[PDB]
Amino acid sequence: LRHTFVVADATLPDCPLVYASEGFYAMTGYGPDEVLGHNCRFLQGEGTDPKEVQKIRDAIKKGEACSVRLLNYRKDGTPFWNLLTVTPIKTPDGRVSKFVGVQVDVTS
Ligand SMILES: *[C@@]12=NC3=[C]C([C])=C([C])[C]=C3N([C][C]([O])[C]([O])[C]([O])[C]OP([O])([O])=O)C1=NC(=O)[N]C2=O
Known part of the structure; x- marks a missing residue:
């Protein structure tokens, strides 16, 4: 399964x-110069879905794991799931x- 992997500093x-893994940059179109030190929400x-975004925000604060489906956007503006x-x-x-x-592109 084609996936990408990142680490955030809590x-x-x-x-x-x-x-961030080599695939995360390749999938999103952003270089490390525009990714490291930033929050993942630029995507x-x-x-x-703001309700889906909220589940990630809550779990982080509560220190739990979480799995959501989000619409994201590459640097060129085009969307992906x-x-x-x-x-x-x-x-x-x-x-x-x-x-x-772990981020998986599920646009099939
Ligand atoms: C993002 N991946 C991602 C990876 C990790 C390790 C973490 C902690 C968060 C993400 N996000 C979410 C983002 O950082 C943020 O937590 C959410 O936007 C919710 O918080 P706010 O305060 O903004 O409501 C990821 N978000 C994405 O959209 N794509 C990912 O790959």
Whole structure:
């Protein structure tokens, strides 16, 4: 299954991306210069379901894992459907350190 993988830093208050796989750049059209240090929400646009966005926002705050279907947009403006699964990574003290995401393009 063709998938992409990113890492967000949860020690910073707005979860900026700190590592992205070669496919994530190829799929979205953005280079690392425009991805690292930013929140993943730049991928969103008009037809992105705000209720679906809210489930990811809630789970991050509550430190749970979450799986949603989102409409995303490449850098060239064209849309694609992104099955996104975010997973919390905890330190031994139960605190969340990083969030990890698997993104699958499900436009079939
Ligand atoms: C994005 N992938 C992605 C990967 C990780 C590890 C995390 C933590 C989040 C994402 N997002 C969501 C984005 O960062 C943000 O959490 C949401 O927009 C909801 O929060 P807000 O405050 O903005 O409502 C991903 N979002 C995407 O659209 N595409 C992904 O690949």
